[PDB]
Amino acid sequence: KIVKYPDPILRRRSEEVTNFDDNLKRVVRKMFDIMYESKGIGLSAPQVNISKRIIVWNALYEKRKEENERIFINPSIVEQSLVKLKLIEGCLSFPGIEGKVERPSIVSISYYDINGYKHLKILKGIHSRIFQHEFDHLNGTLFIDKMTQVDKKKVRPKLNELIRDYKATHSEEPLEHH
Numbered sequence: 001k002i003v004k005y006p007d008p009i010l011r012r013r014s015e016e017v018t019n020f021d022d023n024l025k026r027v028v029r030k031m032f033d034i035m036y037e038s039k040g041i042g043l044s045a046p047q048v049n050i051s052k053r054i055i056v057w058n059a060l061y062e063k064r065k066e067e068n069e070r071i072f073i074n075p076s077i078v079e080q081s082l083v084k085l086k087l088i089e090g091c092l093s094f095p096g097i098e099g100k101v102e103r104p105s106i107v108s109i110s111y112y113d114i115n116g117y118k119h120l121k122i123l124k125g126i127h128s129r130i131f132q133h134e135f136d137h138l139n140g141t142l143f144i145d146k147m148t149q150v151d152k153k154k155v156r157p158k159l160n161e162l163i164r165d166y167k168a169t170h171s172e173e174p175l176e177h178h
């Protein structure tokens with residue numbers, strides 16, 4: 001189940017994986033599932049209601065494919081370029097909400113694979129973009145924290161819209177409208 005703003009889980013600090021077993025492969029499996037089915041480019045584990053530090057993505061989910069899939073367990077950003085850029089970013093937790101965000105172009109990361117083994121890699125361009133989006137998710141950061149002042153405003157209606165919907169959870173009482 002794909003979660004949405006402002007579930008308060010999206011704001012909790014995700015925990016390190018410790019057991020790199022089969023269970024995990026399935027959790028990761030189901031993670032990709034939701035992703036492909038929700039027309040989304042990346043996805044992190046809190047985004048499907050799991051407070052664990054997992055990130056996955058696909059540059060070309062237009063045509064879902066093996067090993068075109070990228071997986072990162074317990075990531076860490078160890079250096080970032082000084083060169084920044086703003087691109088339009090979206091989020092499967094904010095449907096129909098889009099804005100420009102400023103992030104470093106390139107990132108030096110460390111992470112652990114599905115099996116437990118550490119890895120050092122340099123991500124640039126799209127991969128860099130998707131990485132920092134999903135990584136923010138693991139620390140309780142949402143891209144509306146980093147959004148420009150202009151786009152943050154230009155999108156308040158929508159954001160507020162989403163808070164309504166969500167309040168229709170403990171809404172068996174009519175004091176929450178539509």
Ligand SMILES: [Co+2]
Binds near residue numbers: 092093137
């Ligand atoms: Co997101």
